[PDB]
Amino acid sequence: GMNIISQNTAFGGMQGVFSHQSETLKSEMTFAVYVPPKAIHEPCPVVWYLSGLTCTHANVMEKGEYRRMASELGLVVVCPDTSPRGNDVPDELTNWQMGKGAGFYLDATEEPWSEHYQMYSYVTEELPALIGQHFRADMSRQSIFGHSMGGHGAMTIALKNPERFKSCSAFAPIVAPSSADWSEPALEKYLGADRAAWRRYDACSLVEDGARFPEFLIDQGKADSFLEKGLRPWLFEEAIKGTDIGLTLRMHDRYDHSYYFISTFMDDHLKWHAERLG
Amino acid sequence: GMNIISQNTAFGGMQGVFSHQSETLKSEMTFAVYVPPKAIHEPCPVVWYLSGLTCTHANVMEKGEYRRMASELGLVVVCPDTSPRGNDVPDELTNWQMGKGAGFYLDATEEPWSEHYQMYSYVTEELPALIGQHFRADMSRQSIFGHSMGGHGAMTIALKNPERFKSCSAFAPIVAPSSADWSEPALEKYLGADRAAWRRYDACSLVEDGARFPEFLIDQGKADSFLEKGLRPWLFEEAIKGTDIGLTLRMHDRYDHSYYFISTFMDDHLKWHAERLG
Numbered sequence A, B: 001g002m003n004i005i006s007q008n009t010a011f012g013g014m015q016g017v018f019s020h021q022s023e024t025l026k027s028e029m030t031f032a033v034y035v036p037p038k039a040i041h042e043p044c045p046v047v048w049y050l051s052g053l054t055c056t057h058a059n060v061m062e063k064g065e066y067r068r069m070a071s072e073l074g075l076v077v078v079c080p081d082t083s084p085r086g087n088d089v090p091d092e093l094t095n096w097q098m099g100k101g102a103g104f105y106l107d108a109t110e111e112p113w114s115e116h117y118q119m120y121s122y123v124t125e126e127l128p129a130l131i132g133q134h135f136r137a138d139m140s141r142q143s144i145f146g147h148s149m150g151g152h153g154a155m156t157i158a159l160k161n162p163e164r165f166k167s168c169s170a171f172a173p174i175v176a177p178s179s180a181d182w183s184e185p186a187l188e189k190y191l192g193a194d195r196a197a198w199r200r201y202d203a204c205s206l207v208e209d210g211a212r213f214p215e216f217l218i219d220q221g222k223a224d225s226f227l228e229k230g231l232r233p234w235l236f237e238e239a240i241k242g243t244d245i246g247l248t249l250r251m252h253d254r255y256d257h258s259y260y261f262i263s264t265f266m267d268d269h270l271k272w273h274a275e276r277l278g
């Protein structure tokens, strides 16, 4: 079940925007799919890009600069929204760090959030079913990456589902949302005051508890204003000490949190995935 | 005299957004400048990108995908707004083809447009004076390009200032605004019912009247919905016959009017200008 909002040719391929009625989210949902030239010949491998706080599918679609290299490498690029949307969906209106645009890629258990805030189930189950049903996508070759809250999303999803994803990378991820300023309150609202339930939604906690994934690429800007209190990639370096998990963590002078940083290193990430997708 | 709105590192260069008080437009005005890594060591050539209807500096800055090749080629990229701005600037509110976002790179003579709508003088005199003052730019090496109304802007400006610019290109330009549905009413409102005054602001008319410039690159999508009524690049082909003006007109299957088309062919245009900027 799917509505076509827009279709535009870019680098020989097709960048589309689509909407559907989500059952897991009880919402009409909008997402973007870029289909490369090669898809006419064969179903192509999928990279799932998960966006950060306040974003929709549009921020990366417009600014990520992924189509040139996705076209070259023959990659399908899927960009979901970041929360449920709609009049019925509850929100925290005066906090951009909570509610709409702020689903934290988890399955909410607390009221009122529980009804619509099922982003973990949406990204891992419902939307992949819809993509396979409707697009020229090889569902046996899927990878996942994202920005910030999206990097949190990408990494926790990979660690919890290692056999579903060939590779994982991130741009400025929240690697330890359980103790990060902008994510701790959200976790408490969505999941409750008892911090034990949070461990399946924290990349570091998941590693601590024995979850594994082959390796990760993480790019991080040194001038990123969120680095010290919000991001703290070193905590992930600490968590993986003594494990088999590979980490290629690159810290970049002068680069910040924005799409100017993301777009700069986008080709590296697309190649990273294409190589590991097989 | 300039204000810094934003600075962001992208491909080793700096994408900035700035504002100033414009004397020519009696407006507070915002523009974008990308400074490539080459400017760390030496003055760089400047490409001016003029945007189309409804745009600000933002559309191309976010979606044009020029920074990767601009950084590589060592090009300063300046992206002005498309009209005067402010709460007391006259407009046709719901007409996206007139007033705000629709200055047509002309100096208006008719009331009430006369007061603020001096986009030709802004782009050719005032803003270049500011750019040379505040940036490590080699003003002896300047080129100009644009999209649609901005293609009309770049082309008419080049034709009237052949010694100022080394090269000129356009994405889906309005080559003959005097007989196009979306531009003909604007010319009449800004310049008067007497079509004689429109000739200085029509690429085809300028050529007919003896204006020259070495050559133009024009990219045009075949699936562009404005092709037959608003664009008609074949009219410029006709105008340059028996003249010394060169034209490389490329017509692309499946491509439309959007930034998906513009970004696909951006590298070609940047290389075109870099070549001729020496």
Ligand SMILES: [Cl-]
Binding pocket: A052, A053, A147, A148, A149, A150
């Ligand atoms: Cl975030």
Ligand SMILES: [Cl-]
Binding pocket: A223, A224, A225, A226, A256, A257, A258
């Ligand atoms: Cl930042």
Ligand SMILES: [Cl-]
Binding pocket: B052, B053, B147, B148, B149, B150
């Ligand atoms: Cl236009």
Ligand SMILES: [Cl-]
Binding pocket: B223, B224, B225, B226, B256, B257, B258
């Ligand atoms: Cl179109």
Ligand SMILES: [Mg+2]
Binding pocket: A091, A092, A093, A094, A095, A096, A097, A098, A099, A100, A102
């Ligand atoms: Mg909120």
Ligand SMILES: [Mg+2]
Binding pocket: B091, B092, B093, B094, B095, B096, B097, B098, B099, B100, B102
């Ligand atoms: Mg208007």
